[model samples]
Target: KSKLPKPVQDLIKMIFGGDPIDVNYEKLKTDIKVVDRDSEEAEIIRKYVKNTHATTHNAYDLEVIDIFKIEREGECQRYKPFKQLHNRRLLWHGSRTTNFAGILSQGLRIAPPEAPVTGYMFGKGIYFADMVSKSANYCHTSQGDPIGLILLGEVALGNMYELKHASHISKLPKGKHSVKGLGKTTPDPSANISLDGVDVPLGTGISSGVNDTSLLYNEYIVYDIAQVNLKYLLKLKFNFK
Candidate 1:
């Protein structure tokens, strides 16, 4: 039978604001399925991994241990409205293993209102990275923790309001659905590919339209929680030396 750890339950309550007894964690944990490494699905992830930096970004070394598919209940229904908006892309989201229980149960959520504003760079929204290496940094901060989980999410970034320096914005221009912190380097737009209707910037890195910026690699933020649909979970062995 599927079950959740006590720490997972406490974290679920803290982030999702519901009774931890609900066992939503178990519900999500149950939906996770291992992907066959030799299959087409695996190839998609493999290519993505092969082109992670498209250029070069390394924090120690990373080896994909496994890939998992998560069909979380009702996540589709929540994301249905966003399907109408174009510019959807599969992006990377990195977090500690301890947060997966809450993430799988509640989907990705914004920071709590009481959280410090300084905690966020482009306001209190969920952050995503185009470069896997950029996201891999979040998997674990300590050298001892060499393994961590990362997610690939289909983000419905309808219209992005680009930024260079930090704005700490709470409002966007009319018709904007997301924010993009422009980087010095970005995935080659001309090299984009599609998978079952989702765009994958599986391209190598190239010079961006921007020249001067605070960021090195592109970062995306979506204010709405429903705009994200978690697509894949990867177990990575971070070879720290």
Candidate 2:
């Protein structure tokens, strides 16, 4: 004796009147039968549950009945488009990474470059923004994943992250500026290129010497973690004071 959503309710009301009783109530409640939850009739109730979750009554109300999904992938595609019911995107290989990246790119504030450099970028643009290192992996921008991005001021992934040796954001100054000042040496500035800063951990395989007893002890570095810096930059450059 399950209740359907408003639309289905109204439809049932039209067909069987306002107080329609469950035709299969005895079999479902008394015997507790397990029929195909994804059946067509179930879909009608599911829609009702998702849209009416706020007002639905009973623990096993329409909302509970709405969780059922089709066994066949192709069949399930129909409901996958709806975020509330179910979506295959959540099951994608890199879905979690993409989602995290998105959150950082858009959720944080970004700062524009001035003088030497025009600007810097980081995050997926949907989650974190700017404050990225030039030598960091996917942290520079949202590529296909969230390789070297930071979350809450810490690197999301440690040594598994990649470091680049671009001169765009380096301490050395080459003749042309950027990498020109660093003047290639035996070790090469690129070789020293690291994603280190603050107290973030490095990716896997790469040792950071976090423990005093171990050679792995190293400082942590991360990206897209400079909201305070952004504020200061804005205030200093634009008179945001």
Candidate 3:
């Protein structure tokens, strides 16, 4: 103690002169989170339902439905029509009694022979004669995550379509049911569809909706299509199930 540095000796005396510090190891251990866990978060992990057999792609010619033709074209031109479904029936017919999931399952039954057949289903936004009170389409982005739209299109494709431009007005329609390419944004290769599982080439002519946020005329399109089980794929990718 005498040989120690003057500062060290003085510090020891200052610390030890007081009552020895009492360390509660058990209490300290309890206070510390021994395992990596987020206190503010709780999550569940479960096995998604087993993947059933792959669905068959029917030999159907893909065509744009007339009611949605102009709207579809508007959405296509606005967003750069990469790949999407025009009519809901182009994918599935639920017989008006099928559960939503069941309908989706049936929708997967049709796909293009290519590795992935991507496309969006058409659902008219609540078209209002009064422009101020119109509603968005069933899967409109202004309301929620584009996951709903993504799921609908990908399930139809059998191969999942990743959400690229989740919610953006890509087109502006001139007149109702007219396929004129007015108000179409110039085709931007940078704004195209993309692959989900693999990072390869960026796709082109992909986008969502025609026109930005507007009550007058808004349509959407999603790009990227694959030949895979969307439900199972989502579970594996995002732990969604």
Candidate 4:
């Protein structure tokens, strides 16, 4: 059976219309190889699927349609210098399907200077979420268009500058490679698992140390795109009520 539904197949065509580096997005034509429906890769990805059902927020009535492994040009070399950094974790990144061609072609990017500083929570950095719902919300897929794409990336977070509230940062840190927005709810640290060195937080929702709750789920920001290596893309069917 074809895992890709017709609308999703239609949506994917806009990947090349990725809004970032418009020129290169079409040029790179990043390859997205589908994972077998009942295979080893799908087995591992199901772990992620289980976690996505719920962690902090209530799960969406969604089903995984297909999974893919990505091969982006120059991403490995861009991430070479970052391999030494420990605290690597697979995180969720969500965006509109149209942006994927740009995202895969140019990698996740910080907002340009021309963009408003107020637009981003943690200044000009690439953002990621621990909860699939948090990332999926960014997909902005409506009832008219119910399919969305989410990315799982192995981010090399050497040291994180944790934040409790939104801070529009310009510069201050010297050593921290990324920013983490502390959440009242997070995946259980003890239940974290390793798949080929990348940590997957599979634990269900666990309360964190934050008594003064700010965000319900944790958020991450890496100023440099080099810290991220795009791994898998999951196509989801959002069944809106």
Candidate 5:
């Protein structure tokens, strides 16, 4: 009844250096494992399995596996907002030169369609953030959205998402909320992935119950960096069963 093949088991061992997966991925090859597999919470896991890698996250070198998707299910809205914004329209090449100046502002343009637009998982998980180029980190502007980053702001606690410099206040008159102090010509807030379904909305904060503050802070929305082109990027990766 074990669904895992010898080769797949070995491959995962190499990936995590430990036994991270408990079940066999083979069983689901023929049988649908999404609903009949396990607990209600595990239902989300089922969705990811049947659907290739539809819900994903990648930013150049930084990548978060199964970061959520653009919802094709019922009443459920998009899991990630940045994905929604990118769906709207990508940014155009400007005549500027400064790396940060141009790239950082990209976040400003990223405005997701609605709320809870991220796959907020319970417990803890791992996300990899690698740097393709040293300057690429700085290849962002204070106003531009930072790639592979997510910004979770709240009206409470005066929570505000900012680029390199939070003090550099700006405004977005075009958007419904002429909200100033970040939304300027280019408002870069990293990735739109964030933590949802929480009481106080806690991330990896240093305070009481927090983990990686940055992961909890700004989500660095990253697309598949390994894949070269947009076409190949369409093939979503997911785990079944």
Candidate 6:
């Protein structure tokens, strides 16, 4: 019994509530045998065990249980509009390429812009911002599916800060200009644009190259912007950063 998978053991624990005073595995089996196998209660138990097993297996392979748990809980909240979770409009500043700038017009359907071999060397990616203050320091204001990046000069690290591209203490100023035609680009009333510095592999984008210093750069660029629906972004325990 102790050798069973954790979820299997947990299922048994739920069924028996630890152990009956006169409990024995064989006796429990006999007791279970008396219950109608076709009964609704029996079917529910079978489904619950099957689902628990599947959940455990998925959590192990993907390491996404925390996000799964939050998602499951969020579903219940969705029906009660007032209790729903909310995500905000985020900034995304990408390369100077037209494709990067087209996200505002195309939404998430657009693919990565054409790039040199080095861009494909690492996994294709994008950068995003949680707060304007934090976005300015990372290069330019940009924004995400849900990610963060680590800043330089930190001797230590933690999850909260790892999810941040720029340190809150950096205090970089926002750019002076805003994109004039942002409203025309998309019908989304929430869409807006701004100018800011941008960085490669910045803010939760993947970093695959060995040259660490080569990743740093700030190019002033116009950002295509949109509000991401909260449900699409998973708040997982570990970020790409």
TM-scores, all models, native as reference: 0.86, 0.15, 0.20, 0.86, 0.20, 0.19
- Ordered by lDDT, highest first, the candidates read 1, 4, 6, 2, 5, 3
| Cα deviation of 15, candidate 2, in Å | 44
Q: Model 6 segments beyond 4 Å from truth?
A: 1-89, 95-97, 109-117, 120-122, 129-241
Best by lDDT, which number?
1
Question: What is the C-alpha local distance difference test score of each model?
Answer: 0.79, 0.22, 0.21, 0.78, 0.22, 0.23
Show the colliding residue pairs in model 4. Answer: none
Residue 156's lDDT within candidate 4 is 89
TM-score of 3: 0.20
Q: Which stretches of candidate 5 lie over 4 Å from their true place?
A: 5-7, 15-83, 87-241
Give residue 111's error in model 5 in angstroms. 21
| Segments of candidate 3 deviating more than 4 angstroms | 1-99, 108-136, 139-187, 196-241
Comparison by lDDT, 3 against 6, better one: 6
- Clash totals for all models, in order? 0, 35, 16, 0, 48, 8
Give the Å error, residue 110, model 4: 0.5
- Model 3 residue 51 distance off true place after TM-score fit, in angstroms: 32
Q: Weakest 10 consecutive residues, lDDT, candidate 5?
A: 227-236
* Tens digits of lDDT, candidate 3, 1-241: 1543343233223223232222311211111111112321111001000111011211111111111000111222332332342211011111111122332323223233343222322221111110000111222222122221112122222222222232222332432221111112212234322233211111222232555422222222222222212221111111111
Q: Over the stretch 1-241, how does candidate 4's per-residue lDDT look in tens digits?
A: 3354443344455554433343433465565677788997677777766775553334456677878778678888889999878898999999988888678768889889788887467888889887777888888887788888899999988899988888987873998888998888887788888887889886776888887757778889998878999998898888775
Report RMSD for candidate 6.
21.1
Question: For model 2, what is the alpha-carbon lDDT of residue 62?
Answer: 16
Model 2 TM-score (2 dp): 0.15
Tens-digit lDDT string for candidate 2 (1-241): 4554443333223223233345522211111122246664344323322332211111222113212111221222332232132100100011122333223223333223443332222222112211112112222323332222122221222222222222233332222111111101111112221222322111212222223221111112223222111000000000111
